[PDB]
Design an enzyme around this catalytic site. Sequence first.
Site, PDB file in Angstrom:
ATOM      1  N   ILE A 297     -20.879 -23.435 -21.253  1.00 25.06           N
ATOM      2  CA  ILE A 297     -21.797 -24.413 -21.817  1.00 25.06           C
ATOM      3  C   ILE A 297     -22.003 -25.660 -20.966  1.00 25.06           C
ATOM      4  CG2 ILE A 297     -21.269 -23.640 -24.168  1.00 25.06           C
ATOM      5  CD1 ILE A 297     -19.515 -26.126 -24.467  1.00 25.06           C
ATOM      6  N   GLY A 298     -21.476 -25.686 -19.750  1.00 26.04           N
ATOM      7  CA  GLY A 298     -21.742 -26.840 -18.911  1.00 26.04           C
ATOM      8  C   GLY A 298     -21.016 -26.793 -17.587  1.00 26.04           C
ATOM      9  N   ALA A 299     -21.150 -27.899 -16.849  1.00 27.53           N
ATOM     10  CA  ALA A 299     -20.568 -28.060 -15.526  1.00 27.53           C
ATOM     11  C   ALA A 299     -19.939 -29.439 -15.409  1.00 27.53           C
ATOM     12  CB  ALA A 299     -21.623 -27.880 -14.424  1.00 27.53           C
ATOM     13  N   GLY A 300     -18.816 -29.510 -14.700  1.00 32.74           N
ATOM     14  CA  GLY A 300     -18.138 -30.768 -14.460  1.00 32.74           C
ATOM     15  C   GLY A 300     -17.386 -30.785 -13.144  1.00 32.74           C
TER      16      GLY A 300
ATOM     17  N   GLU B 268     -16.594 -26.066 -14.490  1.00 30.77           N
ATOM     18  CA  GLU B 268     -17.269 -25.568 -15.678  1.00 30.77           C
ATOM     19  C   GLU B 268     -16.603 -26.054 -16.956  1.00 30.77           C
ATOM     20  OE1 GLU B 268     -15.948 -22.960 -13.386  1.00 30.77           O
ATOM     21  OE2 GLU B 268     -17.602 -23.744 -12.173  1.00 30.77           O
ATOM     22  N   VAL B 269     -17.343 -25.959 -18.058  1.00 23.59           N
ATOM     23  CA  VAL B 269     -16.872 -26.344 -19.384  1.00 23.59           C
ATOM     24  C   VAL B 269     -17.278 -25.228 -20.335  1.00 23.59           C
ATOM     25  CG1 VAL B 269     -17.055 -27.988 -21.271  1.00 23.59           C
ATOM     26  CG2 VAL B 269     -16.976 -28.802 -18.903  1.00 23.59           C
TER      27      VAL B 269
ATOM     28  N   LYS C 228     -12.296 -27.219 -20.070  1.00 20.48           N
ATOM     29  CA  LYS C 228     -12.748 -27.732 -18.785  1.00 20.48           C
ATOM     30  C   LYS C 228     -11.939 -27.059 -17.683  1.00 20.48           C
ATOM     31  CE  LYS C 228     -13.890 -31.878 -16.223  1.00 20.48           C
ATOM     32  NZ  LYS C 228     -14.174 -33.336 -16.253  1.00 20.48           N
TER      33      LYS C 228
ATOM     34  N   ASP D 193     -17.308 -46.584 -18.782  1.00 19.00           N
ATOM     35  CA  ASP D 193     -18.513 -45.759 -18.836  1.00 19.00           C
ATOM     36  C   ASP D 193     -18.875 -45.425 -20.278  1.00 19.00           C
ATOM     37  OD1 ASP D 193     -20.723 -44.417 -17.883  1.00 19.00           O
ATOM     38  OD2 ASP D 193     -19.634 -42.615 -17.277  1.00 19.00           O
TER      39      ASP D 193
ATOM     40  N   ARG E  36     -24.137 -40.664 -23.773  1.00 17.58           N
ATOM     41  CA  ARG E  36     -23.859 -39.419 -23.067  1.00 17.58           C
ATOM     42  C   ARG E  36     -22.367 -39.123 -22.965  1.00 17.58           C
ATOM     43  NH1 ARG E  36     -25.574 -43.265 -19.473  1.00 17.58           N
ATOM     44  NH2 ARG E  36     -23.735 -44.046 -18.353  1.00 17.58           N
ATOM     45  N   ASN E  37     -21.498 -40.081 -23.306  1.00 18.26           N
ATOM     46  CA  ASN E  37     -20.056 -39.865 -23.329  1.00 18.26           C
ATOM     47  C   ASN E  37     -19.479 -39.923 -24.744  1.00 18.26           C
ATOM     48  OD1 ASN E  37     -19.389 -39.281 -20.633  1.00 18.26           O
ATOM     49  ND2 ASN E  37     -19.285 -41.454 -20.067  1.00 18.26           N
TER      50      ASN E  37
ATOM     51  N   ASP F 203     -15.049 -39.006 -21.987  1.00 19.01           N
ATOM     52  CA  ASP F 203     -15.461 -39.402 -20.637  1.00 19.01           C
ATOM     53  C   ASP F 203     -15.640 -38.132 -19.818  1.00 19.01           C
ATOM     54  OD1 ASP F 203     -16.012 -40.512 -18.197  1.00 19.01           O
ATOM     55  OD2 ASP F 203     -14.395 -41.990 -18.262  1.00 19.01           O
TER      56      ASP F 203
HETATM   57  C1  LIG Z   1      -9.851 -40.449 -17.617  1.00 19.07           C
HETATM   58  O1  LIG Z   1     -11.098 -40.142 -18.141  1.00 19.07           O
HETATM   59  C2  LIG Z   1     -11.115 -39.673 -19.421  1.00 19.07           C
HETATM   60  C3  LIG Z   1     -11.421 -38.328 -19.553  1.00 19.07           C
HETATM   61  C4  LIG Z   1     -11.626 -37.796 -20.819  1.00 19.07           C
HETATM   62  N1  LIG Z   1     -11.952 -36.423 -20.931  1.00 19.07           N
HETATM   63  C5  LIG Z   1     -12.835 -35.876 -21.797  1.00 19.07           C
HETATM   64  O2  LIG Z   1     -13.494 -36.541 -22.593  1.00 19.07           O
HETATM   65  C6  LIG Z   1     -12.888 -34.382 -21.815  1.00 19.07           C
HETATM   66  C7  LIG Z   1     -12.112 -33.573 -20.996  1.00 19.07           C
HETATM   67  C8  LIG Z   1     -12.046 -32.211 -21.220  1.00 19.07           C
HETATM   68  C9  LIG Z   1     -12.751 -31.605 -22.257  1.00 19.07           C
HETATM   69  C10 LIG Z   1     -12.663 -30.118 -22.477  1.00 19.07           C
HETATM   70  C11 LIG Z   1     -13.566 -32.420 -23.059  1.00 19.07           C
HETATM   71  N2  LIG Z   1     -14.453 -31.786 -23.849  1.00 19.07           N
HETATM   72  C12 LIG Z   1     -15.783 -31.701 -24.017  1.00 19.07           C
HETATM   73  N3  LIG Z   1     -16.551 -31.913 -22.939  1.00 19.07           N
HETATM   74  C13 LIG Z   1     -17.794 -31.399 -22.934  1.00 19.07           C
HETATM   75  C14 LIG Z   1     -18.518 -31.443 -21.644  1.00 19.07           C
HETATM   76  C15 LIG Z   1     -19.680 -30.705 -21.438  1.00 19.07           C
HETATM   77  C16 LIG Z   1     -20.298 -30.711 -20.200  1.00 19.07           C
HETATM   78  C17 LIG Z   1     -19.738 -31.466 -19.190  1.00 19.07           C
HETATM   79  N4  LIG Z   1     -18.624 -32.192 -19.351  1.00 19.07           N
HETATM   80  C18 LIG Z   1     -18.043 -32.172 -20.559  1.00 19.07           C
HETATM   81  N5  LIG Z   1     -18.388 -30.758 -23.958  1.00 19.07           N
HETATM   82  C19 LIG Z   1     -17.621 -30.625 -25.045  1.00 19.07           C
HETATM   83  C20 LIG Z   1     -16.302 -31.050 -25.171  1.00 19.07           C
HETATM   84  C21 LIG Z   1     -15.952 -30.734 -26.504  1.00 19.07           C
HETATM   85  N6  LIG Z   1     -16.958 -30.176 -27.141  1.00 19.07           N
HETATM   86  N7  LIG Z   1     -17.984 -30.107 -26.244  1.00 19.07           N
HETATM   87  C22 LIG Z   1     -19.269 -29.547 -26.621  1.00 19.07           C
HETATM   88  C23 LIG Z   1     -13.642 -33.790 -22.822  1.00 19.07           C
HETATM   89  C24 LIG Z   1     -11.501 -38.609 -21.945  1.00 19.07           C
HETATM   90  C25 LIG Z   1     -11.183 -39.952 -21.789  1.00 19.07           C
HETATM   91  O3  LIG Z   1     -11.112 -40.851 -22.828  1.00 19.07           O
HETATM   92  C26 LIG Z   1     -10.728 -40.372 -24.140  1.00 19.07           C
HETATM   93  C27 LIG Z   1     -10.972 -40.494 -20.529  1.00 19.07           C
END
Ligand SMILES: COc1cc(NC(=O)c2ccc(C)c(Nc3nc(-c4cccnc4)nc4c3cnn4C)c2)cc(OC)c1
Length: 280
Positions: free
Chosen positions: A15-18, A19-20, A36, A129, A133-134, A147
């Site tokens: 469902i995305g790229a960062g 893959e997710v 992730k 940030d 979008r976050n 984030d």
């Molecule tokens: C140091 O920095 C920080 C990092 C973080 N890290 C994250 O918030 C983070 C990491 C790992 C995961 C698996 C998710 N989960 C998601 N991410 C995405 C997504 C989609 C496309 C591209 N990127 C992301 N979609 C998601 C979910 C859950 N549901 N969906 C639909 C979020 C948080 C911080 O403050 C609390 C600070």
Amino acid sequence: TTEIHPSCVTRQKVIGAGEVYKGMLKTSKEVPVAIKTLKAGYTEKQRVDFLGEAGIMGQFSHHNIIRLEGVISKYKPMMIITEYMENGALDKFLREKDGEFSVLQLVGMLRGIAAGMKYLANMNYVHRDLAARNILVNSNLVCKVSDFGLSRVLEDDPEATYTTSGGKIPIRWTAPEAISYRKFTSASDVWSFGIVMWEVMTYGERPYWELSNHEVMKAINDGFRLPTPMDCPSAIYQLMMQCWQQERARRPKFADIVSILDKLIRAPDSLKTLADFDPR
Ligand SMILES: COc1cc(NC(=O)c2ccc(C)c(Nc3nc(-c4cccnc4)nc4c3cnn4C)c2)cc(OC)c1
């Protein structure tokens, strides 16, 4: 943090790229999660940071902060596992649902975002940030601060003479003192929260849409601010403006914000807007 074993994880829908990925996680039954994963080719920089994100995430435990289920750090692919948020990112969600929410429901979303940021501010964690979008959204409209790290994606050549230092900043979301002097504090996060308030109340419009990046920076130091959203109650726009005071010491604290919104919510006549009137 909590080490998950690959056996308990199953990837399903990319469902995305960062893959997710979207997948499932077993606890003893199973639950849906977001997974992730690191690029199938990485460096000590791209890998040590992948793990370093999850060490930060594990510190947080709050209803309005994305919850880290665990990490897979002893196998390939490595995985950072969080709860799954069905309605995705707030800004895309609001454009999708443009116009479908009451003022009460939008202010409830802001209350939740504010509550997450209050928890982070008390941990002395500065986000840097904070933007729609976050923010992730679950099926019950609960909003959780996240984030995705787009501020820290660099496009520098690996042999470049000059390289980016300190990541990049989101100009349209960043307080003036942070832009100019790199003074990042919860008070500059409060500025960003003000921008997020505007995003929510406009259903995801682009801040200062008419202006260039350099023209925004000029406008802000000349004392201009984003205009009122349509149908925005007076008190809500009044609160953004206070978030955007030029001197950071004069801005509300996240504790003051959570409290100001609670009071509007429990006296909803203050949140009345004619668009929410139903003649029936
Ligand atoms: C140091 O920095 C920080 C990092 C973080 N890290 C994250 O918030 C983070 C990491 C790992 C995961 C698996 C998710 N989960 C998601 N991410 C995405 C997504 C989609 C496309 C591209 N990127 C992301 N979609 C998601 C979910 C859950 N549901 N969906 C639909 C979020 C948080 C911080 O403050 C609390 C600070």
